[PDB]
DNA sequence: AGCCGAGC
DNA sequence: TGCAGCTCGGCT
DNA sequence: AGCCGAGC
DNA sequence: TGCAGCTCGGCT
């Protein structure tokens, strides 16, 4: 079921040159654009679709290149010949299609199919650009309207002189990564500024449109230093806290259900594999998977590679994702609209910098991002000793249940270590692997090699068993002691590749002002994350205070009303709104205080009005004072304490449940 | 799909070894995970992604190219013909035992029989030696045991394409014994019997639809969860089918509801008369038949407008709503305002049974039902596709002769302008113009030339011909000629009852007549719960209007007398226990919320006015409504709908 | 010989 | 029920 | 010569 | 972003 060209009648005959190939965007598309033709249009036009991303030819390998589907179905449809050059008319005359319409996606990622496209014809066969043989098109019916105006929605790309070249190898160059930077970077601060046609050129295309793609790239898979998540991710959490979910949801069900309450505008299959990632919780996945992983999620026999299908495995939140985003801070996010739908916040605040937890990655474009695992518990202890003033310890690298060795070369730099013992004179153990070395790779990178030799070397050990479980990693070695020796005599752990270092120095991600920022050290990033989580602490203090303030003064009322009308000093009794309104006024009622608070972020009665006749009754009345009373007593405790002491309440909150699930990890 | 080889498998211990067959890939991960280290030496695993061939009466060529059959025979060095009945013969296969593991569900058991039914056929020695097994979801390992000729016919019965009249007798014991009871080796014989019977029946409840609403129970989750969404915009397909999924607790592969809800959505020729969900995006034309619908993920959906009215949302108090797992999901049928089984033509293939009807015309339905209403008899019907223009014409009982439209311009030019229901452009064009235009190396070319001006929901060739053919063509009938006529034959309308027995039914009379009575008196029960329930809130009202007036008389107080103290007092004046609350419960001490549960607001000027208003009003909606007779209600909705199915069907025209 | 459609 | 290769940067 | 993951 | 072949019964 491979793509399947619908070759113009004309092509590769005595009117080649005037046939176009337009490249779609996938079936769909094709379909459309096949219909939109119809039978006069299948004459000069050939549609053949393009199912994503396609190979950067630039730097390929010629393995890559010769082998790669699209790059050469291409060549074969086009006629294309590597090494021509197309200068003359002459030169053309061995084509089968004298152009090439591309039409994706109106989108950055369509917009990123163009360029690749671009970069291909540009790096094979640049005296073809100068003959203008790229070209861009911006329901059946509505597809078949569209066609019959063809000529108003074609653009022309146009070779304009050496600042295309210079755009075209900026954008794709693996030699360019420097300048991509600089490029990006003009980008972005041009743009912060600002919040305070026929004929295309290469240049204009490169600057104007790819950009954008360059942009987003980033803003998709650089995490932000504030909570630790990508967009992506920060929708399945909104979506998750939203629902509420008390049993497991299918993941291919919630990752539909993300896809509407937040907006997500890609393949919910993108959606489905970050889902299974939030929830993998073997060694060298999470510190604190915020998901449950429900089935098949993934063992460190594959990292992971091994999960079910999403349609056959379940989640839902850990007990430990409230504790750590509590939902009163909500009130202090600034959530996001989109179509005016409100969806997911700008950012989450955790009580601890999650980014630092479970290790944010990922790879853009100028910048990419790589952070290990730091441990939980030895992060809210550095929280508590910089809430008093003390500094912070420094702090290495630490994954969940990994027996091995993490040791400081230098900085950023680490050496990690699985664990190798010696049991007899023929026999070492193996119970560890370092962290992200998965076992079967070990087994036949490492451990068969050794079994049968290589061309260029002889069998080191004599046999391996393996009595691994899901969990842990157990290789029994027989060797014999002459070779047991010798390994020893080397580095054991050299001999068997249980070394491998661990390098920190792109720690590139989104500061809380949006800007992407590199860090030196996870100090930085610790000091970073605890200015603005203590700033938030006073936040939440603040909106608290003017909150329950409001419902104490809004109870007052209610409590002195209540008590009027039963004293008979009010009736309202077959009064009228107008009369009752101007008489409350009088006897000093206040408007809605919750109203009038909520607004400063005529005079309102209903608060007081809609209560029921029960509240006129003996037990409705005690009860309205002891809440009266209790509130009032609310809004001082919290008055007296610190930002501080709000955290730390939190810190413990979560610190004890983190035990209780921990402890049921290590026996279920 | 990928064999994992076990380690003994093909060498001396070929038959100490055991080819593990699963279901889908995931489980034989899960089965290569669970066979442990030691497992690789005398286990194989080999994934099934679904149903195989039934080679019991398939072409050669189907069983010479099935990829699943032939990787079987490879991997187990199966060879056909060969008999294996003693010592010798056994030394070729590099298996001992095929092991079956499947999901404990229907659609599982019938992999199984598949199975079964492939060595039965083409190696029945095999099967005395033992050669099957299952592992069911060491003592999970169940053996099938041939016992005699009473499994060859018990196979024969539910494979056999000669079969269909026993598996008709087959399942209709099972139904009957099913209903009257509503008040380790393992024979072949017992497996058909008593665990493959369960996926044919459960194959009929979802492939063959009800009388009562012409849904099929897939259709119907995908009905219920729209209704309870309750969508003003789009949403996608795909979303749509997992949210289905969802919220009616539906156990299949969501790529199937999303086909459902795509053949719900379209509206061209041939397909819905009327289309309850919008077809918005690409779904399907009557070039292709809906073949060219794009992907689900690109396309959307939502209600029409004319669903609610069809389905009115009253009617769902009358409901029996059924439960998957504690969660209450979609009723056990809908009753529509007509019987939807006839208007969109209900089709579908079972086990035993299939059904096909042909649709209807939608007002002719609505006529024959009021007729009905009147005590008239209904008049005859013929099958009817919105915006067909050929003719359809009764040739029989059941049978009908469907034609297109087409007609002599001059002696050189016919235009066709109608093709035969269900015969789509684009086959048409490439299956008889284009033969009639180059020739066959059978046949002839019969027309010089043709010319196309369809339009997207249009039909329109243009024919040149020679004069001498063209006379010829007339002289053999032009819509003959031309392919244009196709017949339709309805000998198979086998449809649920209200009462979930599966029935044949011989005349279209026969299932409006049902579909009447029931839906009749369905507005005998609408009528009794609407009167009932604005009774008991006119009741409500009473009360609420009467504590309200005698509170401002100061006749009462409330005013911090305690709540043992004003429930005795109220019950004392003669108050009344929550009328609503009281009549709910009999569906099947004194409550006064409804009274003291009122706002303060309650007791001012303008309230007060407006509670006598709405007492007095809710007095009159009690009055005005027993007055109306069950008939007089179905023929509101009658002209509801009418009026919008007016607008909608003019709409379309237009657009 | 293949279409119709709800399942794998 | 499954599977079909790439991009982009750092680093190994 | 390939892994990490959010995209097509 | 797509695509891979079958069951089952009644007809064409
Ligand atoms: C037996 O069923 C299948 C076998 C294979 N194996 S092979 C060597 O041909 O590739 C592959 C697929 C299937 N089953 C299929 C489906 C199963 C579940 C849900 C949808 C399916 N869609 C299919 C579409 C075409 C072909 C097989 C499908
Ligand atoms: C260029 O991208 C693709 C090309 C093909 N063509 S071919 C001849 O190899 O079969 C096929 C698929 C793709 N794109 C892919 C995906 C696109 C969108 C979403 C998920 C995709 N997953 C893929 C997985 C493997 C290979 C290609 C994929
Ligand atoms: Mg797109
Ligand atoms: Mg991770
Ligand atoms: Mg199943
Ligand atoms: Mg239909
Ligand atoms: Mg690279
Ligand atoms: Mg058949």
Same mark, same amino acid.
């Given at each position: 079921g491979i793509p399947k060209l619908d070759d %113009?009648?004309? %092509?590769?005959?005595?009117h080649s040159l005037e046939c176009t190939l337009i490249l779609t965007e996938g079936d769909s598309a094709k379909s459309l654009a096949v219909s939109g033709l119809g039978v006069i249009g299948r004459d000069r036009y050939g549609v053949f679709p393009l199912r994503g991303k396609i190979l950067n030819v630039r730097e390929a390998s010629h393995k890559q290149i010769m082998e790669n589907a699209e790059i050469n179905n291409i060549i074969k449809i086009v006629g294309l010949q590597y090494k021509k050059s197309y200068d003359d008319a002459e030169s053309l005359k061995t084509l089968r299609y004298g152009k090439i319409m591309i039409m994706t996606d109106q989108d950055q990622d369509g917009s990123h199919i163009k360029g690749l496209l671009i970069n291909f014809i540009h790096h094979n066969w640049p005296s073809l650009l100068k003959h203008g043989f790229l070209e861009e098109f911006i329901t059946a019916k509505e597809a078949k309207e569209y066609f019959a105006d063809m000529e108003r929605h074609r653009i022309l790309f146009r070779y304009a002189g050496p600042e295309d070249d210079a755009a075209i190898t900026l954008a794709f160059s693996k030699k360019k990564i420097d300048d991509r930077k600089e490029w990006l970077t003009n980008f972005m601060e041009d743009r912060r500024q600002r919040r305070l046609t026929k004929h295309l050129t290469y240049n204009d295309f490169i600057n104007k449109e790819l950009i954008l793609f360059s942009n987003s790239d980033n803003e998709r898979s650089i995490p932000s230093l504030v909570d630790g998540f990508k967009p992506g991710q920060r929708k399945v959490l909104f979506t998750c806290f939203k629902r509420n979910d008390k049993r497991e949801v299918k993941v291919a069900q919630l990752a539909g259900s993300v896809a509407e309450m937040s907006a997500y505008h890609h393949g919910e299959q993108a959606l489905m594999m970050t889902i299974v990632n939030l929830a993998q919780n073997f060694v060298?996945?999470?510190?604190?998977?915020?998901?449950?992983?429900?089935?098949?999620?993934?063992?460190?026999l594959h990292g992971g590679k091994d999960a079910a299908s999403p349609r056959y495995i379940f989640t839902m939140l850990s007990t430990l994702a409230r504790l750590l985003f509590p939902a009163v801070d909500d009130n202090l996010l600034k959530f996001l609209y989109d179509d005016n739908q409100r969806v997911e916040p700008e950012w989450y605040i955790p009580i601890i910098p999650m980014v630092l937890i479970n290790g944010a990655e990922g790879i853009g474009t100028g910048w990419a991002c790589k952070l290990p695992n730091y441990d939980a518990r030895e992060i809210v202890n550095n929280v508590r000793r910089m809430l008093d003033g003390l500094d912070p310890h420094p702090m290495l690298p630490n994954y969940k249940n990994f027996k091995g060795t993490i040791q400081e070369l230098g900085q950023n730099q680490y050496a990690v270590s699985g664990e190798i013992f010696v049991v007899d004179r023929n026999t070492v153990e193996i119970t560890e692997l370092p962290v992200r070395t998965w076992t079967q790779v070990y087994k036949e990178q490492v451990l068969e090699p050794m079994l049968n030799g290589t061309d260029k070397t002889p069998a080191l050990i004599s046999d391996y068993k393996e009595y691994h479980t899901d969990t842990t990693v157990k290789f029994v070695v027989k060797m014999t002691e002459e070779k047991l020796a010798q390994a020893e005599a080397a580095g054991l752990h050299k001999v068997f590749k249980l070394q491998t270092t661990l390098t920190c120095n792109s720690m590139v991600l989104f500061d809380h002002m949006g800007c992407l920022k590199k860090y030196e050290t996870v100090q930085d990033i610790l000091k970073e994350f605890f200015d603005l989580r203590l700033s938030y602490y006073g936040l939440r203090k603040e909106w608290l205070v003017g909150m329950l303030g409001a419902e104490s003064t809004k109870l007052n009322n209610q409590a002195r009303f209540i008590l009027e009308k039963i004293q008979g000093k009010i009736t309202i009794e077959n009064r009228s709104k107008k009369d009752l309104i101007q008489m409350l006024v009088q006897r000093g009622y206040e408007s809605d205080p919750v109203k009038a608070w909520k607004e400063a972020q005529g005079p309102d009665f209903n608060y007081i009005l809609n209560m029921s006749l029960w509240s006129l009754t003996k037990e409705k009345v005690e009860e309205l004072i002891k809440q009266r009373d209790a509130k009032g007593r609310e809004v001082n405790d919290l008055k007296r304490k610190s930002p501080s002491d709000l955290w730390k309440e939190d810190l413990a909150a979560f610190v004890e449940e983190l035990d209780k699930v921990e402890s049921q990890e290590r026996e279920d």
């Open positions: %113009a009648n004309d %092509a590769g005959g005595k060298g996945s999470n510190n604190i998977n915020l998901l449950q992983p429900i089935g098949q999620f993934g063992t460190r």
